[PDB]
Amino acid sequence: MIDDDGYRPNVGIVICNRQGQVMWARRFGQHSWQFPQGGINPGESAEQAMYRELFEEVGLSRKDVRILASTRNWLRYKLPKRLVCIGQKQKWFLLQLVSGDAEINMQTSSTPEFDGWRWVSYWYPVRQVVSFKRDVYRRVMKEFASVVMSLAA
Ligand SMILES: [Cl-]
Ligand SMILES: [F-]
Ligand SMILES: [Mg+2]
Ligand SMILES: [Mg+2]
Numbered sequence: 297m298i299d300d301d302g303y304r305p306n307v308g309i310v311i312c313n314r315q316g317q318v319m320w321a322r323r324f325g326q327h328s329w330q331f332p333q334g335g336i337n338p339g340e341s342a343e344q345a346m347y348r349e350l351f352e353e354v355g356l357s358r359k360d361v362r363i364l365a366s367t368r369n370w371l372r373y374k375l376p377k378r379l380v381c382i383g384q385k386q387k388w389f390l391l392q393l394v395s396g397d398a399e400i401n402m403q404t405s406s407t408p409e410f411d412g413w414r415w416v417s418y419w420y421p422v423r424q425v426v427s428f429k430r431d432v433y434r435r436v437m438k439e440f441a442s443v444v445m446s447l448a449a
C-alpha cells in the first residue's frame with residue numbers, strides 16, 4: 297500500500313478502439329469523467345492490478361483487450377489539500393478493445409465506480425479531467441498518441 301512518500305501505488309487504463317477514440321467513464325453519481333484507475337494491492341504486479349481493476353470497473357476480461365503499451369516510470373499527482381495518503385503514483389496501460397462495445401459493463405463488482413461510458417476523441421480527456429490530474433493525463437496521452445493513431449490509419 298502507501299509507501300514512505302505518501303503515494304498510493306496505482307494503475308491507470310486508457311482503452312482505445314481503431315477510430316482514434318478512447319473510453320471515457322463517468323464517476324458514479326458525479327458529473328466528472330475520467331479513465332479507470334485503481335490501487336495496486338500488496339503482492340500484486342502492476343499488470344495484475346490492471347487486469348483486476350479492468351474487470352472490477354469496466355467488466356472486461358484479459359480476453360477482451362490487448363496491451364499495446366505501458367508507461368515506463370511512475371507518474372505522480374498530489375491530491376488537493378482539502379480532498380485528503382497525499383497522492384497516487386501511477387503506472388498507465390494502453391489497451392485496445394478487441395471485443396464488442398457491449399462487453400463493457402460497469403456493474404460486475406460489488407462496488408461500482410462508474411455509471412457508464414462513451415467514446416471520446418483522443419485529445420478530449422486532457423482538458424476535461426479534473427485539474428489535479430491534468431499534468432499526468434497530458435503526459436500519458438502524449439506517450440500513447442502515436443500508437444492510437446497507428447490503429448486509426
Ligand atoms: Cl474496428
Ligand atoms: F478499486
Ligand atoms: Mg478506481
Ligand atoms: Mg477500482
Ligand SMILES: [Mg+2]
Nearest residue numbers: 333334335349
Ligand atoms: Mg481498487
